[PDB]
Ligand code: HEM
């Protein structure tokens with residue numbers, strides 16, 4: 276009836292609550308206190324955060340709700356344009372790029388990307404094989420080396436060579452700093468003052484860097500004529516069956532920037548959290564390592580063998596359950612409608628799906644919801660509708676889901692085949708928030724099982 280709402284700060288409404296280093300975790304705590312739905316107001320805007328499967332299953336009804344761009348996504352659109360993740364469903368370029376790119380992201384496409392994924396995965400294993408006795412691994416940093424290199428190579432046949440360096444690539448410097456400006460711009464009480472003029476000049480400089488670098492990648496490929504098995508070739512050559520049109524070079528650039536963001540720390544976060552949960556749950560690690568040793572019987576894994584890593588796949592889903600690295604998505608009501616028989620919404624009203632809190636709904640998962648139990652995922656039919664949404668919803672779901680899960684299953688399987696792991700610091704989980712999530716400072720030691728490649 277009277278929708279719950281967290282504490283307000285006069286004319287700033289709830290905005291100061293997101294002036295925090297960990298806003299998603301702060302919102303999760305508000306959900307703990309207020310329940311399945313709460314209103315969140317800022318100057319000139321309002322949304323409603325949903326946390327229960329009961330309400331989110333209705334929000335996922337595409338006849339009633341469509342994808343909205345959150346304030347964060349609207350700011351990211353300043354450098355991802357009408358790429359797939361920041362276009363509205365009704366923009367011509369969304370359905371056009373969706374139709375063109377779907378065959379590039381299917382399981383059949385993964386068979387083609389597999390060899391390049393193995394290339395990078397072997398580089399990761401060789402790095403760890405070559406560490407000296409007393410040394411340790413910085414898990415998120417090395418996982419980000421893996422995922423960035425993989426999307427660079429599979430995306431446009433470019434070698435970031437992240438395992439050869441510590442200084443970030445110039446593109447990544449600007450990309451990370453652009454995303455940082457989005458974070459700072461959100462939790463600005465007075466974001467219009469001229470005190471942020473430098474931040475805005477730097478922001479425009481970083482957009483130009485990303486545009487210039489990707490634009491020349493596209494120009495270089497058209498000039499060379501090479502037809503590699505990557506996303507850029509498919510975008511240069513594909514035609515939308517509906518309109519009959521190809522993507523233009525500007526939109527191709529937006530897609531590439533989008534893929535680079537998604538394949539960076541959003542994807543590496545899944546691997547980082549998965550390894551964290553494995554080392555914190557030794558019986559689960561042992562079961563996953565037993566599968567890896569049984570299935571990965573060749574020096575280089577095949578595509579088919581990765582598909583046979585069923586338990587590793589469940590490990591990844593359970594890591595996505597507890598700490599999904601794209602932690603929210605936004606919706607708007609297409610028409611007047613009533614949520615859950617109790618909350619009337621008007622056309623245009625916005626919703627936020629708080630994914631980590633949805634995934635803690637005890638009415639779905641039981642009381643042991645904080646425990647890491649991959650066996651929860653043995654049967655998708657036993658999971659209620661819309662209870663598990665780490666890849667979003669409907670036609671606006673993650674197009675990269677098969678790509679992320681294939682590269683994650685491949686390298687996690689290889690990690691489990693080749694090394695025993697030690698939580699040598701008894702690492703205390705500390706989740707750093709950018710626009711994604713990562714276990715900050717997570718370190719392990721890896722002792723080789725001395726299995727050759
Ligand atoms: C663990 C890794 C990933 C997670 C958790 C994830 C999560 C998500 C989520 C929740 C959405 C829906 C966003 C919304 O509704 O606003 C989404 C959309 C999208 N993702 Fe991912 N993603 C991952 C990896 C990737 C990768 C590797 C790529 C590409 C190389 C990618 C490309 C996209 C695109 C293009 C969309 C927009 C799809 C559309 O609306 O047509 N993602 N992702």
Ligand SMILES: O=C(CCCCCn1ccnc1)N[C@@H](Cc1ccccc1)C(=O)O
Nearest residue numbers: 345347348351360537541601602603604710
């Ligand atoms: O998590 C999400 C959905 C992710 C969509 C962004 C692009 N992408 C990343 C992985 N696949 C697609 N959106 C957050 C904020 C955010 C913005 C940009 C990047 C990450 C996170 C929110 O709306 O609050």
